[PDB]
Amino acid sequence: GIDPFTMSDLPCPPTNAERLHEFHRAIGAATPERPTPPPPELLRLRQTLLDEESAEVRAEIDHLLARQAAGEALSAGDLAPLAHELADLLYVTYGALDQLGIDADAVFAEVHRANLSKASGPRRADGKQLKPEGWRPADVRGVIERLQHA
Amino acid sequence: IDPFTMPCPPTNAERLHEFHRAIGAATPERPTPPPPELLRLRQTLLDEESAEVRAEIDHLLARQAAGEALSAGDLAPLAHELADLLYVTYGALDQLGIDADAVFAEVHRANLSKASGPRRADGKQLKPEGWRPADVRGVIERLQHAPAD
Ligand SMILES: [Mn+2]
Ligand SMILES: [Mn+2]
Ligand SMILES: [Mn+2]
């Protein structure tokens, strides 16, 4: 029940995943709330966008590396194109999850849990990260199942 | 400053900063030119996860080509790999000291603005009058001179 005294501006920004949902509504493509098997044309589209942005990211990394090989000292400002493309890559990665009706935050949270837990393990003498006692793998199947009934 | 003096939920970019603390990795608060070894490592990780995503998409398409209806659970391996790709993509921005949420906000702004334009007869999105591209160089500069953490 909201009222004349209510604050409408939320005190926390939408997530990047929430931004994609808003973007898809804007382009007239309002996407599902729950995991939804896609037609093949949607899967081809998503793969095309990933390949495009991944190719742009690789070109910016290559360009920075070529300049370092030539003896150049990079500046913070030199990173803008790489930063821009890494963000474009997040955009189309989130974009794919959103078009699948899969909440990207819920899946990321489960991956993160497993990765963070693995980070609490010891290192092998050569530096390789080992798993700690009690380690449990990411259960993304369980996450997709929950999302279908939440 | 008193006992009355007394906090938003963590974002995925913030999860990477936490992870990098936990593995003891390079993760400056502000944008920082990386050594070449770091750039080669981030590229390898992107290549690995994007290869894994491509394999899951190819598997789904092959099953659809055979006449199969996919289930929601069939999407679990693809979703897992897309999230792994987010992890190493945010990972790269974090190791660069660049606030991924700040850069993304700016890209979102330009993309959402473009979305408001008309479409060509063939469906191609056009820009509206007054559209402004993403100014990431402006974001980076702001991050260099923002107040301290
Ligand atoms: Mn791009
Ligand atoms: Mn993976
Ligand atoms: Mn920051």
Side-chain angles (χ1 to χ4, degrees):
Chain A
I2 57 63
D3 58 34
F5 313 80
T6 303
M7 302 303 278
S8 58
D9 64 318
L10 247 62
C12 297
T15 73
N16 294 340
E18 292 165 347
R19 290 179 169 116
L20 259 298
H21 195 77
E22 171 192 26
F23 176 74
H24 288 146
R25 185 191 185 185
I27 65 161
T31 47
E33 320 269 55
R34 297 172 183 280
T36 302
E41 61 262 19
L42 183 160
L43 287 172
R44 288 184 211 108
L45 167 65
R46 296 328 296 192
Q47 181 72 68
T48 298
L49 305 165
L50 287 159
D51 287 347
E52 274 159 12
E53 305 300 348
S54 287
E56 295 169 26
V57 172
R58 170 184 301 113
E60 301 300 341
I61 296 182
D62 282 349
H63 297 168
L64 294 180
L65 290 171
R67 297 170 50 206
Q68 298 179 307
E72 295 194 5
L74 300 181
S75 84
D78 285 321
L79 305 174
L82 174 58
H84 183 172
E85 300 308 338
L86 287 167
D88 280 355
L89 182 56
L90 295 176
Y91 214 83
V92 303
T93 305
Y94 279 119
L97 286 156
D98 183 77
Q99 295 206 317
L100 294 170
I102 290 165
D103 176 348
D105 301 331
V107 179
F108 191 96
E110 169 66 3
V111 175
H112 182 60
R113 179 211 51 82
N115 290 354
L116 188 65
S117 169
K118 175 164 159 178
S120 81
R123 295 266 177 199
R124 200 168 66 187
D126 72 344
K128 174 143 179 283
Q129 181 64 248
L130 312 179
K131 285 159 187 177
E133 290 184 15
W135 188 82
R136 287 151 40 207
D139 187 13
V140 172
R141 283 185 188 278
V143 171
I144 291 326
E145 177 62 20
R146 260 179 270 122
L147 286 174
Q148 287 174 85
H149 320 286
Chain B
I1 190 50
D2 55 41
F4 302 86
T5 310
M6 297 166 34
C8 301
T11 65
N12 302 330
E14 289 164 347
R15 286 173 177 92
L16 263 301
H17 190 62
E18 181 185 27
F19 173 79
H20 288 151
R21 282 168 59 84
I23 71 160
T27 185
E29 307 313 310
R30 285 188 206 275
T32 302
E37 291 89 1
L38 181 49
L39 284 172
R40 294 191 290 268
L41 166 63
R42 300 318 305 187
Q43 178 75 70
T44 300
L45 299 170
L46 289 158
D47 289 344
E48 276 167 353
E49 298 311 342
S50 74
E52 283 169 18
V53 173
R54 175 185 297 110
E56 296 310 333
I57 294 177
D58 285 338
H59 300 164
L60 299 172
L61 288 167
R63 288 160 82 180
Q64 293 181 309
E68 262 176 52
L70 300 173
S71 75
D74 283 338
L75 308 182
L78 175 56
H80 183 148
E81 305 303 342
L82 288 165
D84 283 354
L85 187 57
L86 297 170
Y87 215 84
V88 299
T89 304
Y90 277 118
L93 280 157
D94 186 81
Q95 297 250 12
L96 296 168
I98 295 158
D99 181 342
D101 293 331
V103 177
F104 196 99
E106 178 60 13
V107 166
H108 181 59
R109 181 210 53 77
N111 287 351
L112 178 65
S113 179
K114 177 169 178 199
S116 74
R119 291 189 184 263
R120 267 215 307 246
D122 78 339
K124 186 193 158 191
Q125 184 68 55
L126 309 174
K127 292 157 179 197
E129 312 178 22
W131 186 75
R132 318 175 305 101
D135 186 3
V136 180
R137 281 173 168 78
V139 172
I140 305 318
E141 299 185 292
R142 181 152 51 250
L143 295 175
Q144 294 231 80
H145 308 298
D149 273 357

